[PDB]
Amino acid sequence: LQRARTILEFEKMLPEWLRSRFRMGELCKVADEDFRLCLRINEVKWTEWKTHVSFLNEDPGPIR
Amino acid sequence: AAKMGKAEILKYILSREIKEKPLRSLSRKFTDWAYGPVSSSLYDLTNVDTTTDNSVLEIIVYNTNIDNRHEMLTLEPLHTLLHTKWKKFAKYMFFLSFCFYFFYNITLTLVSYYR
Amino acid sequence: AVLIAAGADVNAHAKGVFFNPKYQHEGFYFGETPLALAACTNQPEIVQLLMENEQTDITSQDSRGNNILHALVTVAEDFKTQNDFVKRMYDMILLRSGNWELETMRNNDGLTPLQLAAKMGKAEILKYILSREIKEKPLRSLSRKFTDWAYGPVSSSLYDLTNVDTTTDNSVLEIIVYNTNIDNRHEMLTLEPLHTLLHTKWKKFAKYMFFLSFCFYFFYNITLTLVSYYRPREDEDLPHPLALTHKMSWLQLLGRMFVLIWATCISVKEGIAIFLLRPSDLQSILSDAWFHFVFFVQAVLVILSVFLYLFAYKEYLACLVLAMALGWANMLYYTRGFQSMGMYSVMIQKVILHDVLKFLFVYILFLLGFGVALASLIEKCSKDKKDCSSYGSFSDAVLELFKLTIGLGDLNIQQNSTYPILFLFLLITYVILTFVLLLNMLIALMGETVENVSKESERIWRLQRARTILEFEKMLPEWLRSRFRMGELCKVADEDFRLCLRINEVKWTEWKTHVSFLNEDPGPIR
Amino acid sequence: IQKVILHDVLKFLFVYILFLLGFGVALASLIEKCSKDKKDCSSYGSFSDAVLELFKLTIGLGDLNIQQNSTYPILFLFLLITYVILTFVLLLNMLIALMGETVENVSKESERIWR
Ligand SMILES: CCCCCCCC/C=C/CCCCCCCC(=O)O[C@@H](COC(=O)CCCCCCCCCCCCCCC)COP(=O)([O-])OCC[N+](C)(C)C
Ligand SMILES: CCCCCCCC/C=C/CCCCCCCC(=O)O[C@@H](COC(=O)CCCCCCCCCCCCCCC)COP(=O)([O-])OCC[N+](C)(C)C
Ligand SMILES: CCCCCCCC/C=C/CCCCCCCC(=O)O[C@@H](COC(=O)CCCCCCCCCCCCCCC)COP(=O)([O-])OCC[N+](C)(C)C
Ligand SMILES: CCCCCCCC/C=C/CCCCCCCC(=O)O[C@@H](COC(=O)CCCCCCCCCCCCCCC)COP(=O)([O-])OCC[N+](C)(C)C
Ligand SMILES: CCCCCCCC/C=C/CCCCCCCC(=O)O[C@@H](COC(=O)CCCCCCCCCCCCCCC)COP(=O)([O-])OCC[N+](C)(C)C
Ligand SMILES: CCCCCCCC/C=C\CCCCCCCC(=O)O[C@@H](COC(=O)CCCCCCCCCCCCCCC)COP(=O)([O-])OCC[N+](C)(C)C
Ligand SMILES: CCCCCCCC/C=C\CCCCCCCC(=O)O[C@@H](COC(=O)CCCCCCCCCCCCCCC)COP(=O)([O-])OCC[N+](C)(C)C
Ligand SMILES: CCCCCCCC/C=C\CCCCCCCC(=O)O[C@@H](COC(=O)CCCCCCCCCCCCCCC)COP(=O)([O-])OCC[N+](C)(C)C
Ligand SMILES: CCCCCCCC/C=C\CCCCCCCC(=O)O[C@@H](COC(=O)CCCCCCCCCCCCCCC)COP(=O)([O-])OCC[N+](C)(C)C
Ligand SMILES: CCCCCCCC/C=C\CCCCCCCC(=O)O[C@@H](COC(=O)CCCCCCCCCCCCCCC)COP(=O)([O-])OCC[N+](C)(C)C
Ligand SMILES: CCCCCCCC/C=C\CCCCCCCC(=O)O[C@@H](COC(=O)CCCCCCCCCCCCCCC)COP(=O)([O-])OCC[N+](C)(C)C
Ligand SMILES: CCCCCCCC/C=C\CCCCCCCC(=O)O[C@@H](COC(=O)CCCCCCCCCCCCCCC)COP(=O)([O-])OCC[N+](C)(C)C
């Protein structure tokens, strides 16, 4: 909690053309005509098995 | 929910996923790809990142009325978001603040001892 | 079942980048075959449906050289994050094959599935393999545990020592001890064919070679102390005893030539062991090879004290005194021979890393911070013409604050200060920050470190003694090594001899009728 | 009292005598002959005097004088500060922490041993 205050103080200090360069996430087409600028987190789960419905990409690799 | 400090409702909203097909636009968590145990996912950063004003990350950090403000930064779209800010631009601005202030106390000690 | 009966290939490999990644968060490595996918994803019905088909090649090897049994060892995890099915899939496939062909293949690194489980550090699979027992009569040759005789509660058993003892190269006992990448290397030496095997090596030849190393090194520090304390204290009496400076037929000349012979035999021997073991981790040298550097430094300073004496530089006392002080602090290595004094040296090594180094960083900040602010306040000492104050310089005000912490000397506040009240305010604030706060918080923080590592200090000690035993075993020649061999040949099955080890035990809670033994007569033979 | 002497005091007194006699020779072997001042130039002249001056520094009696008759005045300070860290900071504070374990175990049994 003490280090999180120090990070947000330095982010209000730097100018605008630095702030656009240091931006997180990328635009992802989520649904029909919707773009929401999401963040990506990977994980591994072993205990619960199921058949996979409701995904976005069929090809599971990293694109390019 | 961030201003009053409600932990269990804020955990539900920030990672909400609807599997049922006609109502999938209401989610904030989306499975990008999955193959066996390994899977990937996307977390929506629309009104939680600090790009706008009165963001959810800003309300939790600068809040003095609540007491569990340190248990609310372990939530999964907020823990990774503070780690990425430190790795790109905040661990270098913090090191430059240490060198300008350590050089400041040397040049104040030496001009007061070799007076 | 529809696709296999229609004529699909059941041997196709997936050789892609996604199916064989470079980082573990980008893909999923499973063994590249459709037999290995159905077993690594907990599907017992499709595995049984694939092995009955006569086209399924069950001994295939993928691009890494792995087979079906190497792939199950790679994707195994603990009990907490994965239930048990890797251990149950390892048993189903082996009992269906029915021979030793899968257990003895070698991949491109040159490792069997038994050796690979020790290299990567998989605890639950290695416990299953080293004590595996099949009661069913036609498949009893696949076991590594055999019941020799049993009568009531008392029974005996044999553990196979084929590829786990150190008779061959890259043994399972050698991989566990010399492994630095894993972290649970001290929980893997409590397994039942490995715990008894390290106890037998200590009882026959390792507790006597360890005692002879203590007597040759304790006699070495006596004959270095006495030749450096009873030195001739005259520059006109120039010849030192070492290096044989003057041939005078001096009585007790064997004492100061024993130093030169034994100091080079350490610096050559310890130079090799640093050359072979090449680490990059800072954590590795403070946990495995600390006592190889400090025996090498102590032997260099004795040799370097000889060349600077024959060149007559009057610097040799600064290298002999650093050899006596370092030499008697190295005697704390020989405490691992005892359980009581061995666990006590583990707790010293944890307190210095976790509690002392944090204390010594904050204390030097306060001692040098208040040392300038008291030395910059004292006026020039010429009005009393001699010795008006003890805080005249920075190098004197630091010394007077070091003596106030340990409690020596006297406290005089009538200095030559121009501000006598401000001098008391900075001196009392130093006493509160160090005598009250820091030196009492150090005792409270050591109460946490002791309370955590006391549940682990025994198993860290047995890992340290297991390294010492395997170093003495590589040193003795071949005709000693055949005499000190463990176990005996036991006819296990039809034309099979495996050189097993015997362990007795008593079990009361589970009763059964005894089938599948080796000897009918339960006594010790002869 | 009978449990602390067996488990904690005898282990402390074995490591402490190793350091007190180990650094006692290395400080007594560094002091030059005391004839140039003709009387009482140093207190570390012999092995039996350098041991006594290190015993008095642990319990906290007397005074600390570093202007001895040493030929190497910086090496004399390096071996004297290293003795203070190993005994005053490390060993005498680890003894109090290890007695906290022995008391916490035998206090559940000290009544039945008494009867
Ligand atoms: C004795 C005097 C000479 C010492 C050698 C030379 C000194 C340099 C030191 C070198 C060794 C440093 C530690 C070695 C191993 C690293 C990890 C570790 O265990 O450290 C631990 C604490 O350690 C600290 O917090 C040290 C911080 C202060 C360092 C400077 C003070 C030294 C005293 C000299 C005065 C000022 C010196 C001025 C320079 C600034 C990390 O905490 P942990 O989480 O509990 O450990 C878990 C292990 N893990 C992190 C790997 C997971
Ligand atoms: C386990 C421990 C291992 C490591 C311990 C190793 C060191 C431990 C021990 C250290 C003892 C050091 C004191 C003696 C040094 C010799 C004198 C000297 O060089 O001072 C000179 C410069 O000094 C100045 O003129 C002013 C000082 C400015 C810098 C100090 C600021 C403190 C910041 C600190 C915060 C950063 C550190 C944070 C923590 C890292 C002046 O000398 P003098 O006063 O003119 O003396 C003349 C003597 N005479 C009068 C008789 C002729
Ligand atoms: C006070 C001064 C005079 C003392 C008498 C003469 C001295 C000789 C000593 C004799 C008595 C020894 C112990 C008596 C009972 C044995 C078991 C025991 O409890 O010891 C315990 C610790 O004990 C140690 O670790 C001692 C190790 C250092 C001994 C030398 C230092 C003595 C100080 C003199 C300076 C150097 C002397 C130079 C000689 C080298 C064993 O640890 P434990 O597991 O917690 O105990 C469980 C009991 N059990 C093991 C049976 C299961
Ligand atoms: C609870 C405790 C019970 C047990 C405690 C019992 C003992 C505790 C107390 C002990 C006090 C001992 C000091 C006084 C002894 C008398 C002097 C003497 O004999 O020294 C002689 C030999 O000494 C030498 O010449 C060099 C020493 C070599 C051996 C020491 C190496 C240290 C290794 C140690 C590591 C191994 C041990 C590890 C741990 C066991 C020389 O004497 P001197 O210097 O010429 O003196 C002249 C005096 N005069 C100048 C005034 C005339
Ligand atoms: C509770 C306390 C604990 C903390 C203590 C911390 C230490 C604090 C120390 C406080 C007192 C030291 C300063 C006093 C000044 C003396 C005067 C002097 O000669 O200055 C000298 C200082 O030279 C040095 O720097 C000292 C050398 C040792 C440095 C620290 C030891 C390293 C420990 C690592 C071992 C780790 C062991 C591993 C264990 C894990 C320089 O000489 P000068 O500049 O020319 O001065 C002129 C004087 N004259 C005219 C007479 C020549
Ligand atoms: C890749 C990303 C890195 C780029 C990002 C940097 C771009 C930024 C551009 C502009 C930012 C605005 C600058 C404000 C200036 C005010 C000064 C001041 O008061 O102290 C400030 C200095 O701490 C800093 O702000 C350091 C950041 C860089 C300073 C300016 C660049 C000079 C570089 C020169 C090159 C030198 C050599 C270079 C060697 C190669 C902050 O003080 P504080 O400590 O925060 O306050 C006290 C703490 N408290 C909050 C608890 C009270
Ligand atoms: C029943 C079973 C017993 C038989 C087995 C013995 C046969 C063995 C035959 C040959 C082994 C090879 C000898 C190597 C010599 C090198 C010397 C050296 O450097 O130090 C070595 C001495 O430690 C030993 O190796 C002791 C073993 C016996 C030494 C030789 C026999 C002399 C006996 C004379 C009779 C005397 C009087 C006899 C009284 C009756 C090892 O040094 P270290 O301490 O290991 O290294 C430092 C620790 N470190 C690893 C952390 C860095
Ligand atoms: C190269 C310089 C070394 C000298 C120290 C310099 C101080 C600064 C440097 C490094 C900082 C010291 C931190 C120690 C980190 C390891 C802890 C440890 O070893 O614990 C040990 C306790 O024995 C001791 O180490 C306590 C005694 C302190 C060192 C002796 C000082 C000698 C006098 C100084 C004058 C001579 C000057 C010499 C030339 C400068 C036992 O722990 P362990 O459980 O056995 O762990 C080892 C694991 N292993 C067995 C598998 C290997
Ligand atoms: C002593 C202190 C005095 C002061 C010192 C000052 C410095 C002090 C520094 C550190 C203090 C620590 C002291 C160092 C002790 C090291 C020795 C050791 O490890 O003992 C061990 C063995 O050792 C024996 O007891 C062997 C038997 C002795 C007779 C050997 C005859 C010669 C070999 C014949 C040559 C053949 C032919 C030769 C030609 C080739 C103890 O073993 P154990 O615990 O009883 O075993 C129980 C096993 N258990 C643990 C599983 C339950
Ligand atoms: C009054 C006793 C004083 C010491 C006797 C000294 C002379 C004796 C001469 C011959 C007797 C040989 C048989 C003794 C075997 C055990 C000794 C013992 O009980 O010490 C105990 C404490 O001691 C230590 O751990 C500190 C090390 C120094 C003292 C031990 C020396 C014995 C080594 C023998 C050869 C070196 C000969 C050196 C020549 C000078 C040992 O602890 P432990 O109980 O074994 O812990 C493991 C056992 N456990 C699993 C059951 C827990
Ligand atoms: C957030 C907004 C902030 C805005 C304002 C920021 C600016 C800051 C403003 C003012 C700064 C403070 C005063 C500095 C200037 C005067 C210094 C001075 O004269 O020394 C005085 C002492 O000095 C002290 O009393 C110690 C200073 C610390 C303050 C004590 C509070 C701690 C409470 C702890 C409770 C204990 C309290 C009592 C402790 C003593 C007196 O010294 P003297 O020697 O007698 O005078 C010389 C005359 N003679 C030579 C003839 C004798
Ligand atoms: C793995 C591969 C290894 C290979 C290499 C192995 C070989 C080893 C190589 C070299 C060994 C070290 C040097 C010995 C030879 C010179 C001795 C000497 O001159 O004394 C020097 C001090 O001596 C020291 O500084 C203390 C020695 C310990 C090293 C400090 C590191 C601890 C870090 C703790 C941080 C604090 C560091 C600062 C602590 C002071 C200076 O003494 P002097 O009195 O000023 O000189 C006389 C002049 N006068 C009389 C006019 C004054």
Short mmCIF file of C-alpha atoms in Angstrom, two decimals, chain C residues 154-385:
data_model
loop_
_atom_site.label_atom_id
_atom_site.label_comp_id
_atom_site.label_asym_id
_atom_site.label_seq_id
_atom_site.Cartn_x
_atom_site.Cartn_y
_atom_site.Cartn_z
CA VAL C 154 7.06 -59.05 12.13
CA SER C 155 8.12 -59.00 8.48
CA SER C 156 11.21 -58.32 6.38
CA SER C 157 11.63 -56.78 2.95
CA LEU C 158 14.21 -56.11 0.24
CA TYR C 159 14.77 -52.85 -1.65
CA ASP C 160 16.35 -52.97 -5.10
CA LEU C 161 19.64 -51.04 -5.40
CA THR C 162 20.21 -51.48 -9.13
CA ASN C 163 20.38 -47.89 -10.41
CA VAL C 164 20.07 -45.95 -7.15
CA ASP C 165 23.36 -46.80 -5.40
CA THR C 166 26.55 -45.01 -6.48
CA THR C 167 28.22 -48.03 -8.12
CA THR C 168 27.51 -46.66 -11.62
CA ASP C 169 27.58 -43.13 -13.04
CA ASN C 170 24.73 -40.59 -12.68
CA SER C 171 23.14 -42.51 -9.83
CA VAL C 172 19.95 -41.32 -8.14
CA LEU C 173 21.78 -40.67 -4.87
CA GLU C 174 24.32 -38.49 -6.69
CA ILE C 175 21.73 -36.44 -8.60
CA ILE C 176 19.78 -35.48 -5.46
CA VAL C 177 22.80 -34.37 -3.41
CA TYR C 178 24.61 -32.32 -6.07
CA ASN C 179 21.47 -30.58 -7.41
CA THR C 180 21.27 -26.82 -6.99
CA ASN C 181 18.29 -25.92 -9.19
CA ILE C 182 15.59 -27.55 -7.05
CA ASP C 183 14.58 -26.43 -3.55
CA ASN C 184 13.18 -29.60 -1.91
CA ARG C 185 16.46 -31.52 -2.10
CA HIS C 186 16.34 -31.90 1.70
CA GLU C 187 12.88 -33.50 1.73
CA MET C 188 13.91 -36.17 -0.79
CA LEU C 189 16.56 -37.80 1.42
CA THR C 190 13.91 -39.09 3.85
CA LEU C 191 12.73 -41.75 1.39
CA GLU C 192 13.12 -45.30 2.64
CA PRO C 193 15.84 -46.81 0.36
CA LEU C 194 17.91 -43.61 0.64
CA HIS C 195 17.76 -42.94 4.39
CA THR C 196 19.15 -46.36 5.32
CA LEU C 197 21.75 -46.22 2.55
CA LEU C 198 23.32 -43.03 3.92
CA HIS C 199 23.33 -44.48 7.43
CA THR C 200 25.31 -47.57 6.42
CA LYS C 201 28.00 -45.50 4.69
CA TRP C 202 28.54 -43.44 7.84
CA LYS C 203 28.82 -46.47 10.11
CA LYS C 204 31.47 -48.34 8.10
CA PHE C 205 33.94 -45.86 6.60
CA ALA C 206 32.75 -42.25 6.81
CA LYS C 207 32.82 -41.60 10.55
CA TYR C 208 36.48 -42.63 10.67
CA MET C 209 37.69 -40.63 7.67
CA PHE C 210 35.92 -37.60 9.14
CA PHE C 211 37.74 -38.02 12.46
CA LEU C 212 41.13 -38.22 10.75
CA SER C 213 40.41 -34.98 8.90
CA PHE C 214 39.79 -33.29 12.25
CA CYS C 215 43.09 -34.40 13.77
CA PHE C 216 45.23 -33.40 10.78
CA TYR C 217 43.65 -29.95 10.76
CA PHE C 218 43.73 -29.33 14.52
CA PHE C 219 47.41 -30.26 14.61
CA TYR C 220 47.90 -27.84 11.71
CA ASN C 221 46.59 -24.81 13.62
CA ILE C 222 48.64 -25.56 16.74
CA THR C 223 51.89 -25.63 14.76
CA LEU C 224 50.94 -22.37 13.01
CA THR C 225 49.98 -20.53 16.20
CA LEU C 226 53.11 -21.54 18.13
CA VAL C 227 55.49 -20.56 15.32
CA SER C 228 53.82 -17.14 15.09
CA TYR C 229 53.57 -16.34 18.82
CA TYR C 230 57.01 -17.59 19.93
CA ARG C 231 58.62 -15.78 17.02
CA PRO C 232 62.00 -14.17 17.77
CA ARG C 233 60.91 -10.60 18.53
CA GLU C 234 64.04 -8.89 17.18
CA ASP C 235 64.95 -7.41 13.82
CA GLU C 236 68.57 -8.39 14.47
CA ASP C 237 67.27 -11.93 15.13
CA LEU C 238 65.90 -11.87 11.57
CA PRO C 239 65.53 -15.64 10.61
CA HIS C 240 61.91 -16.76 10.88
CA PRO C 241 61.41 -20.51 11.44
CA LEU C 242 59.35 -20.92 8.24
CA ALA C 243 60.87 -21.43 4.75
CA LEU C 244 64.07 -22.89 6.37
CA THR C 245 65.91 -19.59 6.38
CA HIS C 246 69.00 -20.83 8.24
CA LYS C 247 70.27 -24.41 8.39
CA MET C 248 71.14 -24.65 12.09
CA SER C 249 69.88 -28.18 12.99
CA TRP C 250 67.17 -26.61 15.13
CA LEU C 251 65.28 -28.89 17.50
CA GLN C 252 61.59 -29.15 16.62
CA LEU C 253 62.19 -28.34 12.97
CA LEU C 254 59.40 -30.71 11.95
CA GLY C 255 56.79 -28.25 13.20
CA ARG C 256 57.49 -25.32 10.88
CA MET C 257 58.12 -27.40 7.76
CA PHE C 258 54.83 -29.25 8.31
CA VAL C 259 53.09 -25.92 7.67
CA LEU C 260 54.54 -25.45 4.16
CA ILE C 261 53.82 -29.02 3.07
CA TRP C 262 50.23 -29.01 4.31
CA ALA C 263 49.34 -25.51 3.08
CA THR C 264 50.08 -26.31 -0.56
CA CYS C 265 48.16 -29.59 -0.35
CA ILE C 266 45.04 -27.60 0.54
CA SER C 267 45.43 -24.83 -2.06
CA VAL C 268 45.92 -27.39 -4.84
CA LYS C 269 43.06 -29.61 -3.65
CA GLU C 270 40.61 -26.76 -3.03
CA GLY C 271 41.55 -25.07 -6.30
CA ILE C 272 40.22 -28.10 -8.16
CA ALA C 273 36.87 -28.24 -6.34
CA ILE C 274 36.18 -24.59 -7.15
CA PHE C 275 37.22 -25.24 -10.76
CA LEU C 276 34.87 -28.19 -11.31
CA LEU C 277 31.76 -26.87 -9.55
CA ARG C 278 31.08 -23.60 -11.43
CA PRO C 279 28.15 -21.64 -9.96
CA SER C 280 26.56 -18.37 -11.03
CA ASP C 281 24.06 -17.97 -8.17
CA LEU C 282 24.88 -15.87 -5.12
CA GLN C 283 22.53 -18.12 -3.13
CA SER C 284 24.47 -21.25 -4.17
CA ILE C 285 27.86 -20.18 -2.81
CA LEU C 286 26.41 -19.17 0.57
CA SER C 287 24.63 -22.54 0.89
CA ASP C 288 26.80 -25.20 -0.78
CA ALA C 289 30.37 -24.00 -1.35
CA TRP C 290 31.08 -21.55 1.46
CA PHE C 291 33.68 -23.74 3.15
CA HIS C 292 35.57 -24.31 -0.11
CA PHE C 293 36.47 -20.63 -0.54
CA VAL C 294 37.44 -20.07 3.09
CA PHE C 295 39.79 -23.05 3.17
CA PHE C 296 41.34 -21.70 -0.03
CA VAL C 297 41.89 -18.18 1.32
CA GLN C 298 43.53 -19.47 4.51
CA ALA C 299 46.02 -21.55 2.52
CA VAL C 300 46.95 -18.71 0.15
CA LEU C 301 47.76 -16.30 3.00
CA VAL C 302 50.30 -18.73 4.47
CA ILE C 303 52.06 -19.21 1.12
CA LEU C 304 51.97 -15.49 0.32
CA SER C 305 53.48 -14.83 3.76
CA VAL C 306 56.56 -16.80 2.66
CA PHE C 307 57.38 -14.95 -0.57
CA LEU C 308 57.02 -11.57 1.13
CA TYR C 309 59.33 -12.66 3.94
CA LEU C 310 62.11 -13.90 1.67
CA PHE C 311 61.86 -10.58 -0.18
CA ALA C 312 61.96 -8.88 3.27
CA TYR C 313 59.09 -6.42 2.98
CA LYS C 314 57.97 -6.36 6.68
CA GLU C 315 54.40 -7.04 5.53
CA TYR C 316 54.33 -10.72 6.49
CA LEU C 317 52.79 -10.11 9.93
CA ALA C 318 49.69 -8.71 8.26
CA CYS C 319 49.26 -12.05 6.45
CA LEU C 320 50.13 -14.46 9.27
CA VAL C 321 47.75 -12.82 11.76
CA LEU C 322 44.96 -13.05 9.18
CA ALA C 323 45.84 -16.74 8.89
CA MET C 324 45.59 -17.47 12.63
CA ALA C 325 42.32 -15.59 13.11
CA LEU C 326 40.72 -17.17 10.05
CA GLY C 327 42.15 -20.59 10.91
CA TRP C 328 40.48 -20.90 14.31
CA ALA C 329 37.16 -19.69 12.89
CA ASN C 330 37.28 -22.47 10.28
CA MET C 331 37.17 -25.10 13.06
CA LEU C 332 33.40 -24.50 13.22
CA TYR C 333 33.09 -26.64 10.07
CA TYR C 334 33.74 -29.80 12.09
CA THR C 335 30.46 -29.61 14.02
CA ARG C 336 28.39 -31.57 11.50
CA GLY C 337 29.60 -34.84 13.00
CA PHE C 338 27.18 -34.40 15.90
CA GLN C 339 23.42 -33.94 15.80
CA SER C 340 23.34 -31.52 18.73
CA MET C 341 26.19 -29.23 17.64
CA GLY C 342 25.25 -29.63 13.98
CA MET C 343 21.76 -28.20 14.27
CA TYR C 344 23.25 -25.30 16.25
CA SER C 345 25.44 -24.26 13.32
CA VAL C 346 22.39 -24.15 11.06
CA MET C 347 20.68 -21.56 13.25
CA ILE C 348 23.77 -19.34 13.24
CA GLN C 349 23.75 -19.34 9.44
CA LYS C 350 20.08 -18.29 9.29
CA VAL C 351 20.27 -15.49 11.88
CA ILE C 352 23.22 -13.77 10.18
CA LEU C 353 21.41 -13.69 6.83
CA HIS C 354 17.99 -12.60 8.09
CA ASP C 355 18.53 -10.48 11.20
CA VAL C 356 22.09 -9.24 11.69
CA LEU C 357 22.68 -7.71 8.25
CA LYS C 358 19.50 -5.65 8.47
CA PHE C 359 20.52 -4.36 11.91
CA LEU C 360 24.03 -3.38 10.82
CA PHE C 361 22.70 -1.29 7.94
CA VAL C 362 20.41 0.95 10.00
CA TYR C 363 22.93 1.29 12.85
CA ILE C 364 25.74 2.65 10.66
CA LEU C 365 23.31 5.24 9.26
CA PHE C 366 22.59 6.60 12.75
CA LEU C 367 26.17 6.37 14.02
CA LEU C 368 27.60 8.30 11.07
CA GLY C 369 24.62 10.66 10.87
CA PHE C 370 24.78 11.89 14.45
CA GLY C 371 28.58 11.71 14.40
CA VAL C 372 28.94 14.64 12.02
CA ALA C 373 26.25 16.73 13.73
CA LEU C 374 28.09 16.49 17.06
CA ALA C 375 31.55 17.04 15.57
CA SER C 376 30.37 20.07 13.59
CA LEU C 377 29.18 21.82 16.76
CA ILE C 378 32.37 21.80 18.87
CA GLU C 379 34.39 25.04 18.81
CA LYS C 380 38.17 25.23 18.30
CA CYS C 381 40.07 23.78 21.27
CA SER C 382 42.74 26.50 21.56
CA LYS C 383 41.24 28.48 24.46
CA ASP C 384 42.14 25.77 27.01
CA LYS C 385 45.34 25.02 25.00
#
